[PDB]
Design a protein around this nucleic acid. Sequence first.
RNA 1: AUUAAACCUUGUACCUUUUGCAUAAUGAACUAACUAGAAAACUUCUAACUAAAAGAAUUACAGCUAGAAACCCCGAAACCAAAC
Lengths: 55, 93, 102, 214, 51, 52
Amino acid sequence: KVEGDIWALQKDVEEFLSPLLGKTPITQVNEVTGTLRIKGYFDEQLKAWLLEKGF
Amino acid sequence: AFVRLTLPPPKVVDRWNEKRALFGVYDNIGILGNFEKHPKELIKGPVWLRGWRGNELQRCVRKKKFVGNRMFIEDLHNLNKRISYLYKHFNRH
Amino acid sequence: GTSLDLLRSLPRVSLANLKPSPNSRKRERRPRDRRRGRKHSFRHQYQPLSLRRLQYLIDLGRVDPTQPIDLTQLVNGRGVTIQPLKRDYGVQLVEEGADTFQ
Amino acid sequence: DPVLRKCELRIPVHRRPVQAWVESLRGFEQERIGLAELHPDVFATAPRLDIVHQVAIWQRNFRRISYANTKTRAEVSVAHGPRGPTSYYYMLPMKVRALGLKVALTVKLMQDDLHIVDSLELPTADPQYLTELAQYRHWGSSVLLVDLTHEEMPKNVVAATSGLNSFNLIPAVGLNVYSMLKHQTLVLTLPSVAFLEDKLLWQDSRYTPLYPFR
Amino acid sequence: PYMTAEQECGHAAERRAQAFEAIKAAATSKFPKHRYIADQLDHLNISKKWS
Amino acid sequence: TGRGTSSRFLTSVLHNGLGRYVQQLQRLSLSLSRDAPSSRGAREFVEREVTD
RNA sequence: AUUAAACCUUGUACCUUUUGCAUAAUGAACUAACUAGAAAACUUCUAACUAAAAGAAUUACAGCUAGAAACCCCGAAACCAAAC
């Protein structure tokens, strides 16, 4: 359930996960469905990071 | 082979006739009708396949059950023989 | 929603214009040409409710804390699924959430 | 006095309401009489035309029944010929069909093919008036008229639409994707929009049913 | 032979290691491709016509 | 194919380039449809490149 | 190729089958028509919704629903029942 500029989210998501993951995350963007696919499990870090944004 | 030596007459078809114009109307009866009537209930046709679909053997077997008592004796015997071939083909090959 | 704006610029859609999503439908092979030419019941089946599963219902307010817990109410809230065809005979609890349900 | 409508259900805070010009069919120049708010979750859904494409295929194909039959070599007193009555019936999930209807509504509004009206009532029953009014407002050659319920639809509108092949009159429950696509522009009464929104917005918290909702 | 066995040893070791590292990156780059709304939306231009 | 097909010798129309080159093409005719995907490219060509 | 139809130069009919070979071996007077690949248990792919999913009967500690995705033809010696 991503709304707005997906590219802006991807840039921030890529930046946030690059240090934690150690390299740029491998991701696939399904713009038609408005979803982002990421290899590996990083829900806990992303969920906490989303809370920081205020979502 | 050989081909016609005369041209067929031109034909004009109306695409906005009531049947074409109203095709698909009330297809949302369930969602817009509180789901009281399922769209499957709107199917009109052979009794054994109203709201139901299956393979040829299933369709034939269901047909026999629905109208077996009301079918002709000759037709029933033919249907029984036909069912045998269908059963073996799908269930053994 | 810039996508909506593009629709206004784009021409009016028609029935013929509709096209299936990419990769939604695979191709098929037909014999038109040479391509396909040539060749235990007695033991109760207890359905348990986890303490963690119990905790969120109260915390989410799905089940009223004042009202005593009722298995029928849980079914009313779709908390648990019981199938007569499965012949479920009992209800249990799951150790999960022992440390998270105060 | 503008006719001001607000969505009965709670619009999301992060989503702004969708708005359109309220119209009336009483007079030729009554193009705009009010401003109405439309739920973003209904009238601002993503334009997923494959769902609409799938729904249109479903509409064409779930009613498809072929009665072709032929006698094979064994039945001669065709190796692969049609074999009796054959049907192609299948069912889409109610969630998808509701979503497909939601997608279609946005496209018509964004393409300026949807015209929200207070009521269908017409000063005269002459079919000429409806056609002329459509030309007056530059509506498409085909205009679809939707009312809240079939029983209460005005007599004057019935006569005008009944005699017009390209202008079809349907009730709220009769709305379907194929009719919307076949008709260049859509005319909806304000009560119908609320009726459609309620059913479409009902999908929220879609309890998987163990029995019919009734 | 101009170069003795001592000269040969280790002269090209650095390049060989780098070449494999590039090979490793290319090998482990399998992933699906992204999907864009513009592709679906641009399809409607197929219906464009003159007034 | 050569046996079954015609052939000619190298030649010039009227020694076109001896004094001054003359373009052989003299007339172009274009048919278009207002509402046709097939002619859209030609229709777009008319807007932009036909004048040039 | 040619100025030129024939001359000059080059070239061991076709399908099937043998083995990736026939100077083997099968089959063809010719024309027109007719004449043989059919299934979803699981998976990938395409989407909906999601600790829930399916319009009753189904599965679930990310699952669940929908769609698409598959496997020919002709031909024995025989055998049996009931009439004639």
